[model samples]
Target: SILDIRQGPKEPFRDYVDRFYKTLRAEQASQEVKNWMTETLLVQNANPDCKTILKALGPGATSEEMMTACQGVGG
Candidate 1:
């Protein structure tokens, strides 16, 4: 169900990420599933530069890291 939620077009990145984790926790997802879902959702929604950074960082990268990269690139 958490995965069904997406960042709103005008939503701030920080707020979106916060909402994502909150929903995941409310769903009682395991750490493994959380990590997988985080990476999945971030990659799917990230701008090109952030996506590139996440890809380079591999599966261990966090949503916060993706957000930083996205902001750095002015996305």
Candidate 2:
């Protein structure tokens, strides 16, 4: 599943998010699924500032919110 995708070593943040979202849409994943995947993957793979933003968001953060945070803080 695309939800299982981790960020690749050289993958840019927007690229990862775009791929994940496209795959997720193709798979017809639910919002809950998308949110969980976004939170988990971003936490593991995002930059330190992104991680801090996510941590501040805590649980129940939306995918859009995650994307915005990643884009804001990631290279």
Candidate 3:
């Protein structure tokens, strides 16, 4: 619950991506909460393009993987 991060509509994907790592890097949370963060990102967020790909990427998708997938779609 410590994460207040949200992607702005006009925010560059590069900029939005760091909001996650920057927070998680500086602070730690329960592993369970990390899953909540993931769900909020893919399910709750409207960036559905990569979310669909993420689902295909299976449950083991990592941050770097999502970045690559997102950028792949963006490009």
Candidate 4:
């Protein structure tokens, strides 16, 4: 299971995840794309730093690839 590090005085994990995805999702991403982000990028890795993770995802990641990478646990 993924742990939400940012909570209370720190910050909400949902807020961080939502913010990160919102930036990338601005590219007209689909539901699958959002799912991908939640599953692949956010859920898979335990990194608390959203900026680092987003950068690691790299540039020009299509909605499909992003979704595929973040579809499920242990992806």
Candidates in order have lDDT scores of 0.69, 0.67, 0.60, 0.46
Candidate 1 steric clashes: 0
Candidate 3 colliding pairs = none
The numbered model that scores best in TM-score is 1
| Residue 69 lDDT (model 4) | 45
- Pick the lDDT winner: 1
Higher-ranked by TM-score: 1 or 4? 1
| Per-residue C-alpha lDDT of model 3 across residues 8-71, encoded as one tens digit per residue | 6555455566666567565577877776676555334525565566677666676667667666
Per-residue lDDT of 2 in model 2: 70
- Flag regions of model 4 displaced more than 4 Å: 1-10, 45-75
Question: What lDDT tens digits, residue by residue, belong to model 1 across residues 1-75?
Answer: 785766565565666677777888777767887788888875666545445666887777777677776554544
Which model, 1 or 3, shows the larger TM-score? 1
lDDT of 2 by residue, 26-65 (tens): 7767787666776676566554555667778778776677
Clashing pairs in 2: none
- Residue 11, model 3, lDDT: 53
TM-score of each: 0.65, 0.57, 0.57, 0.33
Candidate 3: residue 61 Cα off by (Å):
0.9
* C-alpha RMSD values across all candidates: 3.0, 3.2, 3.4, 10.0
lDDT of 3 at 42: 36
Question: How well is each residue in 18-72 modelled by candidate 4, as lDDT tens digits?
Answer: 5555565454568776556555555344344433444467765543444444333
